[PDB]
Amino acid sequence: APGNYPSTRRSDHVDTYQSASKGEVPVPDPYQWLEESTDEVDKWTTAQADLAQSYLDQNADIQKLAEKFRASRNYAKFSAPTLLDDGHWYWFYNRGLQSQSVLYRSKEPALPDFSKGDDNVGDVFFDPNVLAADGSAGMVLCKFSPDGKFFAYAVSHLGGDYSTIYVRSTSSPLSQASVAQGVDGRLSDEVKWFKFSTIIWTKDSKGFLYQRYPARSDRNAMMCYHKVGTTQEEDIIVYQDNEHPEWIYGADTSEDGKYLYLYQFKDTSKKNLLWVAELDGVKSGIHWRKVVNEYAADYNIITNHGSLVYIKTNLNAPQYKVITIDLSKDEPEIRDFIPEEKDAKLAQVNCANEEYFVAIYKRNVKDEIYLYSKAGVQLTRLAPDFVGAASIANRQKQTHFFLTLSGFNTPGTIARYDFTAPETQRFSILRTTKVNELDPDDFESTQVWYESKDGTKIPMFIVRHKSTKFDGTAAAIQYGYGGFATSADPFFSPIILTFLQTYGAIFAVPSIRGGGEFGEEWHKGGRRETKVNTFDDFIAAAQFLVKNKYAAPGKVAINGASNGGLLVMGSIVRAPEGTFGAAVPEGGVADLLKFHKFTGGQAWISEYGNPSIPEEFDYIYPLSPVHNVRTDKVMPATLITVNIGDGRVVPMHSFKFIATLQHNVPQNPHPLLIKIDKSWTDKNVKDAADKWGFIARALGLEL
């Protein structure tokens, strides 16, 4: 229980604020000088950093944990494959070295066995890392032509604002081999000024649509059409609007060849227009049937059968739905095809094997996968016990589709559904993620519900190694963010899973208010004047973990970053003594009275309120971690983290908070320390090892 923290000078600096209830309020701010960039601050930072490192050096498990994190750090990433009209399969593969994934082509015209290795079953077709010799050019976006003969790709060099589209034949690889042989085998096509749209081929495979601006703010966008094997001078303007210079455009083409769709956007909401047109291919002076005119709702087209168009929309349905619009009638006949679900956001719909719809719902922060008929009958749920995120990849005419699945236990699993197979054998696993010292199958993701202070029911994710028991024994790592409508969705971290497996601990992720887990009302429920709910939900989660025997008492550690740092710091201030065993806030806000007076501060006003406004000060001040540190409560072992390289949140917040703790509870039984991140395999797990090792020791966990 040492008192040996370095002395922090206390100045006579007093800030004055205005309270709606109390009037003028003088607030002493003796660590105000830590706001400034001076030698005094730099020397105080070194003294604190050195203390922190001295404590970490008495923990020999830090270096042991580092090697385990080094082991599980690297792994390959991949996409689901696509079968093109040339009979070959194409897919992205990243071996885990370079920042850009490489596009592979199957050697044989057949679905590869992906347990053999990507280089054994595939050849490199497009390696974007060699666009520029130094790796300074990136592929932003790409698209194959419907006939499989050509490949369009948008390239962005690090300097430029815009990007440039290029075309190459699918028989012309770009690789380390190919560039060594001589000149790049692309076509001469160089489509400049491309920005903020997809690339959309016509179904004739003759050309593609793309958004472009004039040459050099961004104004007067043009949805254009580029013929393959031509210069940009040969291009057509499909649409522009002189009268609304800020407007942005999207396009789409129907598989049958009949329709060209124009989307129009005016702002950062999801509302959009939808005009429809009939084709021969794409030419100029298009007569647009203006179906969705006026900005009402989100409308994204799924597919069509003749004049019947299927559309995902949120018109009078916040959780989305599917409608049909029949265009053979003179007036379009709008009908509900798949109705809104009250408690399930319709996320994605794809037509599959012509007479079916594959479909993704998010319900209780989890994706569910459904198979529907062309008449809208729900035929079955696929992968019912899956806990995570799912997306669909397919082409409408083919007799299969894929699912890309991810969660806490894996960053990637490709599933295949084969309509031609026997009923019991339609669903299969194409491939899984390989990580040293970690099998995805050893980790179970569940969801439990607890009651917060005001009676609100919050779901919470629990992850464990399968040998760990819910018998009041395990340590728990409780992660949160708690703001900005940013959901704590399932995410993959080898560092965490290795930690759960090493110590028999559990990972706990509560869907606390302030996040986006149940839409804008959920955010609204933990924002500005309701912000205290965010903290009460987080605190009630930790109490629930112990009460219901998920974790042992005194063994729930908390961690979060940026807004999560404020969450952690505010929570150890507010929560009853002994609620938490350890605490690691990373780069967090902590002075909630001054946050808006520093770089990036103003953007947080919509989340916490404005301290300069008297009525808002009154609900802000009682939350401010820097102004609510008591003398008479034992704080849990606390390692505060800041990345001095990371501009985001000024380190001032953490400096003030640690100085305040060390002053208010100098004889605190557990160490209260601040660490400066060494990093702004070998050198990449150093900060994580210090962090997770501090927690393990603080919770009394042995290797």
UniProtKB/Swiss-Prot annotation:
<dbReference type="InterPro" id="IPR001375">
    <property type="entry name" value="Peptidase_S9_cat"/>
</dbReference>
<feature type="active site" description="Charge relay system">
    <location>
        <position position="562"/>
    </location>
</feature>
<dbReference type="GO" id="GO:0070012">
    <property type="term" value="F:oligopeptidase activity"/>
</dbReference>
<comment type="function">
    <text>Dual function macrocyclase-peptidase involved in the biosynthesis of the highly toxic amanitin toxin family of macrocycles. Cleaves peptide bonds on the C-terminal side of prolyl residues. The enzyme first removes 10 residues from the N-terminus of a 35-residue substrate. Conformational trapping of the 25 amino-acid peptide forces the enzyme to release this intermediate rather than proceed to macrocyclization. The enzyme rebinds the 25 amino-acid peptide in a different conformation and catalyzes macrocyclization of the N-terminal eight residues.</text>
</comment>
<dbReference type="Pfam" id="PF02897">
    <property type="entry name" value="Peptidase_S9_N"/>
</dbReference>
<feature type="active site" description="Charge relay system">
    <location>
        <position position="646"/>
    </location>
</feature>
<keyword id="KW-0720">Serine protease</keyword>
<dbReference type="GO" id="GO:0006508">
    <property type="term" value="P:proteolysis"/>
</dbReference>
<dbReference type="InterPro" id="IPR029058">
    <property type="entry name" value="AB_hydrolase_fold"/>
</dbReference>
<comment type="subunit">
    <text>Monomer.</text>
</comment>
<keyword id="KW-0378">Hydrolase</keyword>
<protein>
    <recommendedName>
        <fullName>Dual function macrocyclase-peptidase POPB</fullName>
        <ecNumber>3.4.21.26</ecNumber>
    </recommendedName>
</protein>
<dbReference type="InterPro" id="IPR002471">
    <property type="entry name" value="Pept_S9_AS"/>
</dbReference>
<dbReference type="GO" id="GO:0005829">
    <property type="term" value="C:cytosol"/>
</dbReference>
<feature type="region of interest" description="Disordered">
    <location>
        <begin position="1"/>
        <end position="28"/>
    </location>
</feature>
<dbReference type="InterPro" id="IPR023302">
    <property type="entry name" value="Pept_S9A_N"/>
</dbReference>
<keyword id="KW-0645">Protease</keyword>
<dbReference type="InterPro" id="IPR051167">
    <property type="entry name" value="Prolyl_oligopep/macrocyclase"/>
</dbReference>
<comment type="similarity">
    <text>Belongs to the peptidase S9A family.</text>
</comment>
<dbReference type="GO" id="GO:0004252">
    <property type="term" value="F:serine-type endopeptidase activity"/>
</dbReference>
<dbReference type="InterPro" id="IPR002470">
    <property type="entry name" value="Peptidase_S9A"/>
</dbReference>
<dbReference type="Pfam" id="PF00326">
    <property type="entry name" value="Peptidase_S9"/>
</dbReference>
